[PDB]
Amino acid sequence: MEEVTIKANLIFANGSTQTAEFQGTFEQATSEAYAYADTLKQDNGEWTVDVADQGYTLNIQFAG
Numbered sequence: 001m002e003e004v005t006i007k008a009n010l011i012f013a014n015g016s017t018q019t020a021e022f023q024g025t026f027e028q029a030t031s032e033a034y035a036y037a038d039t040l041k042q043d044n045g046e047w048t049v050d051v052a053d054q055g056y057t058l059n060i061q062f063a064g
């Protein structure tokens with residue numbers, strides 16, 4: 001009946017960028033953004049994440 005969309009910005013240590021839009025509940029979309037970043041952690045290293053636009057915007061930076 002009511003859901004949201006979260007836009008994650010992924011900044012790689014190489015310097016490239018990637019955008020990933022997730023849809024579903026407020027909880028689900030956030031959990032999925034972290035899932036995508038977690039799989040990438042093996043070839044991009046540990047990362048940090050920041051909450052923007054009340055959670056609808058996610059900034060994810062790979063520390064390498």
